[PDB]
Amino acid sequence: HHHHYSYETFLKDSLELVKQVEQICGVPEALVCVMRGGMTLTHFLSLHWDLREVYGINAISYDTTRQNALKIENIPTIKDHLKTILVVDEIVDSGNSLEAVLKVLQDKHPDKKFYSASLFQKTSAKYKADAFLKDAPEWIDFFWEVDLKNLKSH
Amino acid sequence: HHHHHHYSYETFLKDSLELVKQVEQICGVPEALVCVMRGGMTLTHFLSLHWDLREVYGINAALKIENIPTIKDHLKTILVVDEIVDSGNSLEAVLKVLQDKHPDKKFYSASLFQKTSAKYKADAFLKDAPEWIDFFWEVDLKNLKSH
């Protein structure tokens, strides 16, 4: 029931995500990483595609004890000559964060085409990424979340 | 010419715990991170999760500094994260632009590797950089794709 998503599984999945992205939009011209969860994935993908145009955007949930919890911050200003953009995240749960990221990116950059890719996606998500690899299990620990604290404690 | 050094994932985990300890000694747990993209991305991801920090900003790098973040007013202790400092020109210029823009904040810098000959050195670094070192985030996929 408890899945540890390991670095080795991530390498294999990253190569498959590359294949699946190239099939829909070709090689992207730039990446937007949905911080924090997309950072390691976007680092590996940007080096694989030899892409230096990498931008970040933050999706952060705050306590509504406020009108809306989710808040999208640090909106990048993508350069004019970049038109095919891949937005990268590691898991899509409800889809609310990714949908909000795309909506702001498209509003600010109406000339560009944004595609989205995730490693994992809940089947019941209200909003889904253009490309995803695996249905999200109920309970999942990612190596970037747990390996450093597990090493420290052993 | 130069011998081939390589930085694996397992080495990165052990060194990241040491980097955490040394940053904590110098400035405490940071209130926010600035990742020097691309090379700091994986490191900053792991550090932000370890310290439960959601305030993570990016910046990219003669040459000009691009995509300069605007850091929230209340965040005072900021850690700038890179994986290697070679000449030191990029890190020096990143710090210059951040400090000019946010003069009331305290910026500290950390890197895994640091050239001994660099003109500018990070406040915290763990290892001397050899002439040729490659990193798991650069090479592991290409090897896996080969096999």
Side-chain angles (χ1 to χ4, degrees), chain A residues 89-112 114-123:
Chain A
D89 213 352
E90 81 286 22
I91 185 163
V92 175
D93 188 1
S94 71
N96 287 330
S97 293
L98 183 60
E99 175 164 40
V101 165
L102 292 172
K103 187 175 180 178
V104 66
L105 290 170
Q106 288 171 345
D107 175 349
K108 180 167 176 174
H109 308 95
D111 59 301
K112 307 190 187 304
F114 296 85
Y115 295 87
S116 58
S118 189
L119 297 167
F120 288 94
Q121 174 153 278
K122 281 286 181 173
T123 64

Coordinates of all heavy atoms in Angstrom, one line a residue, chain A residues 89-123, unseen atoms left out:
Chain A
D89 N 5.3 19.0 -13.8 CA 5.0 18.7 -12.4 C 5.1 17.2 -12.1 O 5.3 16.4 -13.0 CB 3.5 19.1 -12.0 CG 3.3 19.6 -10.6 OD1 4.3 19.5 -9.8 OD2 2.3 20.2 -10.3
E90 N 5.1 16.8 -10.8 CA 5.5 15.4 -10.5 C 4.1 14.7 -10.3 O 4.1 13.5 -10.7 CB 6.3 15.3 -9.2 CG 5.6 15.3 -7.9 CD 5.1 16.6 -7.3 OE1 4.8 17.5 -8.2 OE2 5.0 16.7 -6.1
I91 N 3.1 15.3 -9.7 CA 1.8 14.6 -9.5 C 0.7 15.6 -9.6 O 0.8 16.8 -9.2 CB 1.8 13.9 -8.1 CG1 0.5 13.0 -7.9 CG2 2.0 14.9 -6.9 CD1 0.7 12.0 -6.7
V92 N -0.4 15.2 -10.2 CA -1.6 15.9 -10.4 C -2.6 15.2 -9.5 O -2.9 14.0 -9.8 CB -2.1 15.9 -11.8 CG1 -3.4 16.7 -12.0 CG2 -1.0 16.7 -12.7
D93 N -3.1 15.9 -8.5 CA -4.0 15.3 -7.5 C -5.5 15.7 -7.9 O -6.1 15.0 -8.7 CB -3.7 15.7 -6.1 CG -4.4 14.9 -5.0 OD1 -5.3 14.1 -5.4 OD2 -4.2 15.2 -3.8
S94 N -5.9 16.8 -7.4 CA -7.2 17.4 -7.9 C -7.1 18.0 -9.3 O -8.0 18.1 -10.0 CB -7.7 18.4 -6.9 OG -7.0 19.6 -7.0
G95 N -5.8 18.4 -9.6 CA -5.7 19.2 -10.8 C -5.8 20.7 -10.6 O -5.5 21.4 -11.6
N96 N -6.2 21.2 -9.4 CA -6.5 22.6 -9.2 C -5.3 23.5 -9.4 O -5.3 24.5 -10.1 CB -7.2 22.8 -7.9 CG -8.6 22.3 -7.8 OD1 -9.3 22.3 -8.8 ND2 -9.0 21.9 -6.6
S97 N -4.1 23.0 -8.9 CA -2.9 23.8 -9.0 C -2.4 23.9 -10.5 O -2.1 25.0 -11.0 CB -1.8 23.1 -8.2 OG -2.1 23.2 -6.8
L98 N -2.4 22.8 -11.2 CA -1.9 22.8 -12.5 C -2.9 23.6 -13.4 O -2.4 24.3 -14.3 CB -1.8 21.3 -13.1 CG -1.2 21.2 -14.5 CD1 0.1 21.8 -14.6 CD2 -1.2 19.7 -14.9
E99 N -4.2 23.4 -13.2 CA -5.1 24.2 -14.0 C -4.9 25.7 -13.7 O -4.9 26.5 -14.7 CB -6.6 23.9 -13.6 CG -7.6 24.7 -14.2 CD -9.0 24.1 -14.1 OE1 -9.3 23.5 -13.0 OE2 -9.8 24.1 -15.1
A100 N -4.6 26.1 -12.5 CA -4.4 27.5 -12.2 C -3.1 28.0 -12.8 O -3.0 29.2 -13.2 CB -4.4 27.8 -10.7
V101 N -2.1 27.2 -12.7 CA -0.8 27.6 -13.4 C -1.0 27.8 -14.9 O -0.5 28.8 -15.4 CB 0.2 26.4 -13.1 CG1 1.4 26.6 -14.0 CG2 0.8 26.4 -11.7
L102 N -1.6 26.9 -15.6 CA -1.8 27.1 -17.0 C -2.7 28.3 -17.3 O -2.4 29.0 -18.3 CB -2.4 25.8 -17.6 CG -1.4 24.7 -17.6 CD1 -2.0 23.5 -18.0 CD2 -0.5 25.0 -18.8
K103 N -3.7 28.6 -16.4 CA -4.5 29.7 -16.8 C -3.7 31.0 -16.7 O -3.8 31.9 -17.5 CB -5.7 29.5 -15.8 CG -6.7 30.4 -16.1 CD -7.9 30.1 -15.2 CE -8.7 31.2 -15.8 NZ -10.1 31.5 -15.3
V104 N -2.9 31.1 -15.6 CA -2.1 32.4 -15.5 C -1.0 32.5 -16.6 O -0.8 33.6 -17.2 CB -1.5 32.6 -14.1 CG1 -0.5 31.6 -13.7 CG2 -1.0 34.0 -14.0
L105 N -0.4 31.3 -16.9 CA 0.7 31.4 -18.0 C 0.1 31.7 -19.3 O 0.6 32.5 -20.1 CB 1.4 30.0 -18.1 CG 2.3 29.7 -16.9 CD1 2.7 28.2 -17.1 CD2 3.6 30.6 -16.9
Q106 N -1.1 31.2 -19.6 CA -1.7 31.5 -20.9 C -2.2 32.9 -20.9 O -2.2 33.6 -22.0 CB -2.9 30.5 -21.2 CG -2.4 29.1 -21.5 CD -3.4 28.1 -21.6 OE1 -4.6 28.3 -21.1 NE2 -3.1 26.9 -22.2
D107 N -2.7 33.5 -19.8 CA -3.2 34.9 -19.8 C -2.1 35.8 -20.0 O -2.1 36.8 -20.8 CB -3.9 35.0 -18.4 CG -4.3 36.5 -18.1 OD1 -3.9 37.4 -18.9 OD2 -5.0 36.7 -17.0
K108 N -0.9 35.5 -19.4 CA 0.2 36.4 -19.5 C 0.9 36.3 -20.8 O 1.5 37.2 -21.3 CB 1.2 36.1 -18.3 CG 2.4 37.0 -18.4 CD 3.1 36.8 -17.0 CE 4.4 37.6 -17.0 NZ 5.1 37.6 -15.7
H109 N 0.8 35.1 -21.5 CA 1.5 34.8 -22.7 C 0.6 34.3 -23.7 O 0.6 33.1 -24.1 CB 2.7 33.8 -22.5 CG 3.6 34.2 -21.3 ND1 3.4 33.7 -20.0 CD2 4.7 34.9 -21.3 CE1 4.4 34.2 -19.3 NE2 5.2 34.9 -20.0
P110 N -0.3 35.1 -24.3 CA -1.4 34.6 -25.1 C -0.9 34.1 -26.5 O -1.6 33.4 -27.2 CB -2.4 35.7 -25.3 CG -1.5 36.9 -25.1 CD -0.6 36.5 -24.0
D111 N 0.3 34.4 -26.8 CA 1.0 34.0 -28.1 C 1.7 32.6 -28.0 O 2.1 32.1 -29.1 CB 2.2 35.0 -28.4 CG 3.3 35.1 -27.3 OD1 2.8 35.5 -26.1 OD2 4.5 34.9 -27.6
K112 N 1.7 32.0 -26.9 CA 2.5 30.8 -26.7 C 1.6 29.6 -26.6 O 0.4 29.7 -26.2 CB 3.4 30.9 -25.5 CG 4.3 32.2 -25.6 CD 5.4 32.2 -24.5 CE 6.1 33.5 -24.5 NZ 6.6 33.9 -25.9
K113 N 2.1 28.4 -26.9 CA 1.4 27.1 -26.7 C 2.0 26.4 -25.5 O 3.2 26.1 -25.4 CB 1.6 26.3 -27.9
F114 N 1.2 26.2 -24.4 CA 1.6 25.5 -23.2 C 1.1 24.1 -23.2 O -0.1 23.9 -23.5 CB 1.2 26.2 -22.0 CG 1.8 27.5 -21.8 CD1 1.2 28.7 -22.4 CD2 2.9 27.7 -21.1 CE1 1.8 30.0 -22.3 CE2 3.5 29.0 -20.9 CZ 3.0 30.1 -21.5
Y115 N 2.0 23.1 -23.0 CA 1.6 21.7 -22.8 C 2.0 21.4 -21.4 O 3.0 21.9 -20.9 CB 2.4 20.8 -23.7 CG 2.0 21.1 -25.2 CD1 2.7 22.1 -25.9 CD2 1.0 20.4 -25.8 CE1 2.3 22.3 -27.2 CE2 0.6 20.6 -27.1 CZ 1.3 21.6 -27.8 OH 0.9 21.8 -29.1
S116 N 1.3 20.4 -20.8 CA 1.7 20.0 -19.4 C 2.0 18.5 -19.4 O 1.4 17.7 -20.1 CB 0.6 20.3 -18.4 OG -0.6 19.7 -18.8
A117 N 2.9 18.2 -18.5 CA 3.4 16.8 -18.3 C 3.6 16.5 -16.8 O 4.1 17.4 -16.1 CB 4.6 16.5 -19.1
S118 N 3.1 15.3 -16.4 CA 3.3 14.9 -15.0 C 3.7 13.4 -15.0 O 3.4 12.7 -15.9 CB 2.0 15.1 -14.3 OG 2.1 14.9 -12.9
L119 N 4.5 13.0 -14.0 CA 4.7 11.6 -13.8 C 3.5 10.9 -13.4 O 3.1 9.9 -14.0 CB 5.8 11.4 -12.7 CG 7.2 12.0 -13.1 CD1 8.0 12.1 -11.8 CD2 7.8 11.2 -14.1
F120 N 2.8 11.4 -12.4 CA 1.6 10.7 -11.8 C 0.4 11.6 -11.9 O 0.5 12.8 -11.9 CB 1.8 10.4 -10.3 CG 2.8 9.3 -10.0 CD1 4.2 9.6 -9.8 CD2 2.4 8.0 -10.0 CE1 5.1 8.6 -9.6 CE2 3.3 7.0 -9.8 CZ 4.7 7.3 -9.5
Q121 N -0.8 10.9 -12.1 CA -2.0 11.7 -12.2 C -3.2 10.9 -11.5 O -3.3 9.7 -11.9 CB -2.4 11.9 -13.7 CG -3.7 12.6 -13.8 CD -3.7 13.3 -15.0 OE1 -3.3 14.5 -15.0 NE2 -4.2 12.7 -16.1
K122 N -3.9 11.5 -10.6 CA -5.1 10.8 -10.1 C -6.1 10.6 -11.2 O -6.4 11.5 -12.0 CB -5.7 11.7 -9.0 CG -5.0 11.7 -7.7 CD -5.3 10.3 -7.0 CE -4.6 10.3 -5.6 NZ -5.1 9.1 -4.9
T123 N -6.7 9.4 -11.2 CA -7.7 9.1 -12.3 C -9.0 10.0 -12.1 O -9.6 10.4 -13.1 CB -8.2 7.7 -12.3 OG1 -8.9 7.4 -11.0 CG2 -7.1 6.7 -12.5

